[PDB]
């Protein structure tokens, strides 16, 4: 049982939860690989038992016989079909645990408050699209963002998956120029190509919302364009730097990740788009200032009349902060939900304490919990953490193509 | 071998050096403890020693030569006769440089071959330690043009106490616990402070009082020695455009000289082996002055800068912090004392990575310690995947001798 210290406070806890870690991460006693981005009925049954037992203990009915009724019910269903169906209550619970268990999520204070949309009855790409449009509409909620997940049918043998080819529901195009550069978002060059390949007539803005590439089982994907009324965006302005608006920067309201696979009691849902709301550093530091994303830092520093020929002026730092100020200011002015890295990490600290009392620990990935600016100015910097894999879980998955 | 990717560039390497790791860290396939601050006869001494000698003869490209074979046989014989052995001077020099080279948490390793090694293994008294230490400080400081150095005191040996320096660094500021529960001076140095007093030091009452040294010779209590004022170079802190900043009366010292780690070379242990480089401004700017459990000046500066400190989303914290970093860098450049900002340091570390990949097929690195405590993703190391592991020769933590 690892001993975990907070070095700001000197306080000590013990992670007993990590003893129950489902699968194995990439580390060994010889070498730590924690900085890496990517780490049969009997096998299915075993995972299924564990989930069901989990669920009943969470509702104070372990040793009950609704428990044992459910237990043997699943045993019979897989015995007869090779898979099994989750009760809707079990799907909600599994969806919340999987969020709750995601080591790299700082927003997890909210894990018990999630809206789950059951789309397991989905049959077509058009249906998929309509489910997605309802999701986007519900979660956005005119700027008062609400956490939501939509769950499409589970993978099953002898049938293709439901997949959402886009990495997010809202993505900006990344147009490759022949000079090798990218207009728009470099992150989305691959999918901007694939959208075009599947017939999308490309735009040429720095912020063209992509079409959706949705794929029903065993059929090729189909292009669907989002009703621009559904896609809430925020023009970016700065509270006191009047020229900032003219840079023409914008970003969207809804972080709706669409390419991770959801696992629940051995069952795998390859298409289960979820969304929350943004931490400002995601937009302001990573998306706008990463060298391989929009990379706007020097543009802004030049506008701020900062000396950019030496690094000890900290021109890079001063401009990143102001870009983050503009993100925060613009979202608030537009009444769109957003949280700053200080507020968010303070909340995660509270979450650690709640989880320590709730489950005797909390899997956390330090490198992702600590914000990409002002890291040590936030409390999580000083908090030792233990990283491990529980189930249910959100996992990465290979590309559908 | 671990595939390792840089996400800024897309480039990919493999760390084959990590397979040479022969001492275990805290992680398992079930749970990673990478973020923990403390990640922790004759035949294994010999396999440790043989490996080290092999390292040395490889380094001068005379592997398998008669001299290599001869030195192996010599060490084996000395171990057989005495239970230990002594490094040749040349081996010690290389050993110390290799320990620096092997430290996963040092972002300054581009410099690792430029290290001045003072050999103090003939040292016999605490008084003599002090002499060796003053000469260290003199050489390293070099009137503000800093030079990396290490002074190696005698090795651990059976039936004789260790040489120890009780202070964590050669230069430290006193931290006096106000009965308030608070602290005047530097809170990180409260225990060494009260020990200095308990051992006879007449204390001060300022925030930047330089601590005396408690030096320990074998089997003898620690002895108290005062640093000569003229030996301790300090920089007054001022801001290039914030003139009121100077009125905060802040200062730091020039020389970061860590004195409480254990140097380990080919099985031998050197409990006392102080080393020094030069500061990265974030250590002073962000950590030392803005950690809530250190000088904790962030809020006072933000108020002075007239920022809205009643709401996080104004980012008053980030703003005051950046300016404090600017002030440190400015002050040091003004005083003409070497210092490196975190942008330059990390870029040079990227260059170190590329050298090491070529030279050794890997480089042990602790991502959480290599990324600066501000502006992390603004620096290139943020996007570089890293493999953390323990090579020897090594610098190690060791228990406080009290
Ligand atoms: C409600 C407010 C939320 C906030 C403020 C928040 C914040 C964050 C942030 C900043 C990250 C780092 C992502 C990155 O750096 O790319 C993250 C990661 C993550 N989040 Fe949360 N999140 C929220 C809600 C959710 C929800 C509703 C789910 C799932 C149901 C979720 C699941 C995850 C997962 C699985 C990751 C890992 C990132 C990855 O592997 O790509 N989060 N979150
Ligand atoms: C010459 C300029 C140097 C720079 C800019 C530099 C930079 C740094 C920094 C910023 C840290 C992290 C400190 C912390 O956060 O507490 C560090 C750690 C470390 N450095 Fe360097 N360093 C330099 C020279 C040296 C030298 C000369 C040695 C030894 C010969 C050394 C050995 C180490 C070791 C062993 C650590 C691990 C820290 C620990 O575990 O407490 N460095 N270095
Ligand atoms: C390019 C890439 C990025 C990543 C992390 C992205 N994580 C996004 C994400 C996921 C979930 C989120 C939930 C809430 C939120 N505010 N942001 C959230 C952001 C992993 C792998 C690759 C690859 N290849
Ligand atoms: C309080 C604490 C702190 C630490 C990190 C200290 N790192 C110092 C250090 C070591 C070598 C350095 C080399 C150069 C430089 N500029 N700073 C350097 C700073 C570890 C354990 C504990 C404990 N307990
Ligand atoms: C190389 C490094 O592991 C990688 O860039 C990680 C580090 N921490 C991160 N943390 C968050 N929140 N998001 C990220 O994309 C990353 N990237
Ligand atoms: C808990 C956490 O690992 C701890 O505060 C570490 C993080 N990384 C660090 N990295 C450096 N360079 N210096 C530090 O003091 C720390 N502190
Ligand atoms: Cl994003
Ligand atoms: Cl220091
Ligand atoms: Gd101008
Ligand atoms: Gd001024
Ligand atoms: Zn690890």
Short mmCIF file of N, CA, C and O in Angstrom, two decimals, chain A residues 95-144:
data_model
loop_
_atom_site.label_atom_id
_atom_site.label_comp_id
_atom_site.label_asym_id
_atom_site.label_seq_id
_atom_site.Cartn_x
_atom_site.Cartn_y
_atom_site.Cartn_z
N UNK A 95 -20.82 4.07 -16.86
CA UNK A 95 -20.39 5.30 -17.51
C UNK A 95 -19.80 6.27 -16.50
O UNK A 95 -18.79 6.93 -16.79
N UNK A 96 -20.40 6.36 -15.31
CA UNK A 96 -19.87 7.24 -14.27
C UNK A 96 -18.58 6.71 -13.63
O UNK A 96 -17.67 7.48 -13.32
N UNK A 97 -18.49 5.39 -13.42
CA UNK A 97 -17.28 4.84 -12.83
C UNK A 97 -16.10 5.04 -13.75
O UNK A 97 -15.00 5.31 -13.30
N UNK A 98 -16.34 4.91 -15.05
CA UNK A 98 -15.26 4.95 -16.02
C UNK A 98 -14.63 6.34 -16.08
O UNK A 98 -13.41 6.47 -16.22
N UNK A 99 -15.47 7.37 -15.97
CA UNK A 99 -15.04 8.76 -15.82
C UNK A 99 -14.27 8.89 -14.50
O UNK A 99 -13.09 9.30 -14.48
N UNK A 100 -14.94 8.54 -13.42
CA UNK A 100 -14.38 8.52 -12.07
C UNK A 100 -13.01 7.83 -12.00
O UNK A 100 -12.15 8.20 -11.19
N UNK A 101 -12.79 6.86 -12.87
CA UNK A 101 -11.53 6.10 -12.84
C UNK A 101 -10.44 6.60 -13.76
O UNK A 101 -9.33 6.10 -13.72
N UNK A 102 -10.75 7.59 -14.60
CA UNK A 102 -9.81 8.08 -15.58
C UNK A 102 -8.70 8.86 -14.90
O UNK A 102 -8.94 9.97 -14.44
N UNK A 103 -7.48 8.30 -14.85
CA UNK A 103 -6.40 8.95 -14.11
C UNK A 103 -6.04 10.34 -14.61
O UNK A 103 -5.63 11.19 -13.81
N UNK A 104 -6.18 10.59 -15.90
CA UNK A 104 -5.73 11.86 -16.45
C UNK A 104 -6.79 12.97 -16.39
O UNK A 104 -6.53 14.08 -16.81
N UNK A 105 -7.98 12.68 -15.86
CA UNK A 105 -9.00 13.72 -15.78
C UNK A 105 -9.01 14.53 -14.47
O UNK A 105 -9.27 14.00 -13.39
N UNK A 106 -8.79 15.84 -14.61
CA UNK A 106 -8.78 16.77 -13.49
C UNK A 106 -10.19 17.23 -13.12
O UNK A 106 -10.42 17.77 -12.04
N UNK A 107 -11.15 17.00 -14.02
CA UNK A 107 -12.51 17.49 -13.82
C UNK A 107 -13.38 16.55 -13.02
O UNK A 107 -14.60 16.71 -13.00
N UNK A 108 -12.77 15.57 -12.35
CA UNK A 108 -13.54 14.44 -11.80
C UNK A 108 -14.35 14.70 -10.53
O UNK A 108 -15.09 13.83 -10.09
N UNK A 109 -14.23 15.88 -9.94
CA UNK A 109 -15.15 16.28 -8.88
C UNK A 109 -16.62 16.14 -9.35
O UNK A 109 -17.51 15.95 -8.53
N UNK A 110 -16.85 16.20 -10.66
CA UNK A 110 -18.20 16.19 -11.25
C UNK A 110 -18.72 14.81 -11.64
O UNK A 110 -19.76 14.71 -12.30
N UNK A 111 -18.01 13.76 -11.25
CA UNK A 111 -18.21 12.46 -11.85
C UNK A 111 -19.59 11.86 -11.58
O UNK A 111 -20.07 11.03 -12.36
N UNK A 112 -20.22 12.27 -10.49
CA UNK A 112 -21.53 11.74 -10.14
C UNK A 112 -22.67 12.43 -10.85
O UNK A 112 -23.83 11.98 -10.80
N UNK A 113 -22.34 13.53 -11.52
CA UNK A 113 -23.32 14.32 -12.24
C UNK A 113 -23.03 14.26 -13.74
O UNK A 113 -22.34 15.12 -14.30
N UNK A 114 -23.57 13.23 -14.38
CA UNK A 114 -23.38 12.98 -15.81
C UNK A 114 -24.71 12.55 -16.43
O UNK A 114 -25.43 11.74 -15.85
N UNK A 115 -25.04 13.09 -17.60
CA UNK A 115 -26.26 12.68 -18.29
C UNK A 115 -25.94 11.60 -19.30
O UNK A 115 -25.09 11.79 -20.17
N UNK A 116 -26.64 10.48 -19.19
CA UNK A 116 -26.36 9.35 -20.07
C UNK A 116 -27.49 9.12 -21.06
O UNK A 116 -28.64 8.94 -20.68
N UNK A 117 -27.13 9.14 -22.34
CA UNK A 117 -28.08 8.91 -23.41
C UNK A 117 -27.88 7.52 -23.97
O UNK A 117 -26.81 7.21 -24.49
N UNK A 118 -28.90 6.68 -23.87
CA UNK A 118 -28.80 5.30 -24.32
C UNK A 118 -29.14 5.18 -25.80
O UNK A 118 -30.30 5.28 -26.19
N UNK A 119 -28.12 4.94 -26.62
CA UNK A 119 -28.32 4.82 -28.06
C UNK A 119 -28.00 3.41 -28.54
O UNK A 119 -27.72 3.22 -29.72
N UNK A 120 -28.07 2.44 -27.63
CA UNK A 120 -27.79 1.04 -27.97
C UNK A 120 -28.79 0.45 -28.96
O UNK A 120 -28.55 -0.61 -29.54
N UNK A 121 -29.92 1.12 -29.14
CA UNK A 121 -30.93 0.64 -30.07
C UNK A 121 -30.66 1.19 -31.47
O UNK A 121 -31.44 0.95 -32.39
N UNK A 122 -29.54 1.90 -31.61
CA UNK A 122 -29.18 2.54 -32.88
C UNK A 122 -28.91 1.51 -33.95
O UNK A 122 -28.39 0.43 -33.67
N UNK A 123 -29.27 1.82 -35.19
CA UNK A 123 -29.18 0.84 -36.26
C UNK A 123 -28.53 1.40 -37.53
O UNK A 123 -28.04 0.64 -38.37
N UNK A 124 -28.52 2.72 -37.67
CA UNK A 124 -28.03 3.34 -38.89
C UNK A 124 -27.11 4.53 -38.64
O UNK A 124 -27.05 5.07 -37.53
N UNK A 125 -26.39 4.95 -39.68
CA UNK A 125 -25.55 6.13 -39.60
C UNK A 125 -26.39 7.39 -39.41
O UNK A 125 -25.98 8.32 -38.72
N UNK A 126 -27.57 7.41 -40.02
CA UNK A 126 -28.46 8.56 -39.89
C UNK A 126 -28.97 8.67 -38.46
O UNK A 126 -29.01 9.77 -37.90
N UNK A 127 -29.36 7.54 -37.87
CA UNK A 127 -29.75 7.51 -36.46
C UNK A 127 -28.62 8.03 -35.57
O UNK A 127 -28.84 8.85 -34.68
N UNK A 128 -27.42 7.52 -35.83
CA UNK A 128 -26.23 7.94 -35.11
C UNK A 128 -26.13 9.46 -35.14
O UNK A 128 -26.03 10.11 -34.10
N UNK A 129 -26.20 10.03 -36.34
CA UNK A 129 -26.16 11.48 -36.51
C UNK A 129 -27.18 12.23 -35.66
O UNK A 129 -26.86 13.24 -35.02
N UNK A 130 -28.42 11.72 -35.64
CA UNK A 130 -29.49 12.36 -34.87
C UNK A 130 -29.26 12.26 -33.37
O UNK A 130 -29.51 13.21 -32.63
N UNK A 131 -28.79 11.11 -32.91
CA UNK A 131 -28.37 10.98 -31.53
C UNK A 131 -27.29 12.01 -31.17
O UNK A 131 -27.32 12.64 -30.11
N UNK A 132 -26.33 12.19 -32.08
CA UNK A 132 -25.23 13.11 -31.83
C UNK A 132 -25.74 14.55 -31.78
O UNK A 132 -25.31 15.35 -30.94
N UNK A 133 -26.68 14.88 -32.65
CA UNK A 133 -27.22 16.23 -32.67
C UNK A 133 -27.98 16.54 -31.37
O UNK A 133 -27.83 17.63 -30.80
N UNK A 134 -28.76 15.58 -30.89
CA UNK A 134 -29.42 15.75 -29.60
C UNK A 134 -28.40 15.94 -28.47
O UNK A 134 -28.55 16.82 -27.61
N UNK A 135 -27.36 15.11 -28.48
CA UNK A 135 -26.30 15.22 -27.50
C UNK A 135 -25.71 16.62 -27.48
O UNK A 135 -25.71 17.30 -26.45
N UNK A 136 -25.18 17.04 -28.62
CA UNK A 136 -24.60 18.37 -28.73
C UNK A 136 -25.56 19.44 -28.21
O UNK A 136 -25.16 20.32 -27.43
N UNK A 137 -26.84 19.32 -28.58
CA UNK A 137 -27.84 20.29 -28.16
C UNK A 137 -28.08 20.27 -26.65
O UNK A 137 -28.13 21.32 -26.01
N UNK A 138 -28.23 19.07 -26.09
CA UNK A 138 -28.42 18.96 -24.65
C UNK A 138 -27.21 19.53 -23.88
O UNK A 138 -27.35 20.36 -22.98
N UNK A 139 -26.02 19.05 -24.23
CA UNK A 139 -24.81 19.38 -23.47
C UNK A 139 -24.47 20.86 -23.54
O UNK A 139 -24.09 21.46 -22.53
N UNK A 140 -24.62 21.45 -24.72
CA UNK A 140 -24.34 22.88 -24.89
C UNK A 140 -25.28 23.69 -24.00
O UNK A 140 -24.83 24.48 -23.16
N UNK A 141 -26.59 23.50 -24.18
CA UNK A 141 -27.58 24.11 -23.30
C UNK A 141 -27.40 25.64 -23.27
O UNK A 141 -27.38 26.27 -22.21
N UNK A 142 -27.25 26.22 -24.46
CA UNK A 142 -27.09 27.67 -24.64
C UNK A 142 -25.92 28.30 -23.86
O UNK A 142 -25.95 29.49 -23.55
N UNK A 143 -24.89 27.52 -23.57
CA UNK A 143 -23.71 28.05 -22.91
C UNK A 143 -23.57 27.63 -21.45
O UNK A 143 -22.51 27.79 -20.84
N UNK A 144 -24.65 27.10 -20.90
CA UNK A 144 -24.64 26.57 -19.55
C UNK A 144 -24.34 25.07 -19.60
O UNK A 144 -25.23 24.24 -19.45
#
